[PDB]
Amino acid sequence: DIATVIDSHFEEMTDLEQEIARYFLQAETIQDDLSSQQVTQKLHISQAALTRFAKKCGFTGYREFIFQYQHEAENQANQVSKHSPLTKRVLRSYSNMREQTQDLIDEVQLERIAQLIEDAERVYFFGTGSSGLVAREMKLRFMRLGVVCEALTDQDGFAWTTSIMDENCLVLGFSLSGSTPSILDSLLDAKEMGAKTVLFSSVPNKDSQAYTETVLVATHSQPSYIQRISAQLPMLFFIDLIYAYFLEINRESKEKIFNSYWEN
């Protein structure tokens, strides 16, 4: 804007004043003390040359010119981005995952699952690797609301625990790939025991209907394995959604339980 007006009058300007236009056409200029004193000392010109340049540009003088020079830069810059390409690949990978999950939500299903946890006597969260930390996280959150739950992160524990579940148990299995055999095959063992089974996967079903519920979670935005964000995060979206539905079932009794940590 102010750069275009400069170019339109650039010719009418003397070589020295043309130099002053050149300096202010630089982006680096703003990162500098732009008082008339410093500009004159810096470019080794007189005040009069500065005033003549500013009026060449249609302003009454340097003060009006520089007053806009600041505002302009503040009216932009806040419009531009101040984030590195890496900080932005990270921020967009999260935003992309929040967008995609919002498309994936089956809200009736999540309230169905919140009620299943409520009606279960014992609940178990199966996962390995990063999805085993997700399973750990669920146990702490739902324990504070009074759920009897346990987190298991290895194959011995899976088989060991499946053998002692019954129709009053609920097992939530987390397999981002939708392939992790340890988890998938152990959810099938629990069904044979009569327990209800919910599978979380970022990968569509392939006869996944064998489980009580299959929750489709978001795939990652980054195609390369190394460049992705936490493998936990797709699962955390829906844990926090399920948590929010579950908390509202008998919320009054659950807050008593949640608070009795503090109560001596």
Q: Which residues bind its own copies (CB under 8 A)?
A: 80, 82-84, 86-87, 89-91, 93-95, 98, 101-102, 105, 107, 110, 122, 128-130, 133, 136-137, 140-141, 143-148, 150, 153-154, 156, 159-161, 163-164, 225-227, 229-233, 236-237, 239-241, 244-245, 247-248, 254-255, 257-261
List the Cα angle 240/172/207 in 5-degree steps.
115
Report the 3 state secondary structure along 152-211.
ECCHHHHHHHHCCCCCCEEEEEECCCCCCHHHHHHHHHHHHCCCEEEEEECCCCCCHHHC
**Residue 194 CA to chain centroid, in angstroms?**
38
Interface stretch with Cl ion, choices 205-213, 224-232, 233-241, 242-250 (CB under 5 A): 224-232
Q: Which among its own copies, Cl ion, none contacts residue 27 (Cβ within 5 to 8 A by kind)? A: none
SS3 (DSSP) at 215: strand
Asked whether position 233 contacts Cl ion by CB under 5 A, the answer is no
User: Which span sits near Cl ion by CB under 5 A: 86-94, 122-130, 141-149, 252-260?
Assistant: 86-94
End-to-end CA distance of the chain: 67
220 binds, among its own copies, Cl ion, none (CB under 5 to 8 A by kind): Cl ion
Output the smallest distance, CB 176 to its own copies, in A: 13
- Contact window for Cl ion (CB under 5 A) among 38-46, 88-96, 181-189, 251-259: 88-96
The nearest distance, CB 125 to its own copies, in angstroms, is 13
Is 42 in contact with 62 (CB distance < 8 Å)? no
92: three-class secondary structure by DSSP = helix
- Token pair in block for residue 111: 């309230």
Q: Which does 245 bind (CB under 5 to 8 A by kind): its own copies, Cl ion, none?
A: its own copies
Partner from Cl ion, its own copies, none contacting 124, C-beta within 5 to 8 A by type: none
Q: How many helices (H) and strands (E) are present in the chain, helices listed first?
A: 12, 5
Q: Does 222 bind Cl ion (CB under 5 A)?
A: yes
Window contacting Cl ion (CB under 5 A); options: 102-110, 177-185, 216-224, 247-255:
216-224
Nearest approach, Cβ of 49 to its own copies (angstroms)?
26
Q: What is the spatial distance between Cα 129 and Cα 179, in angstroms, rounded to a whole number?
A: 14
220 belongs to the binding site for Cl ion (CB under 5 A): yes
> How far apart, in whole angstroms, are the C-alpha atoms of residue 154 and residue 129?
9
Taking the complex as a whole, how short is the minimal distance between the CB of residue 34 and its own copies, in angstroms?
A: 20
CB 158 within 8 A of CB 113: no
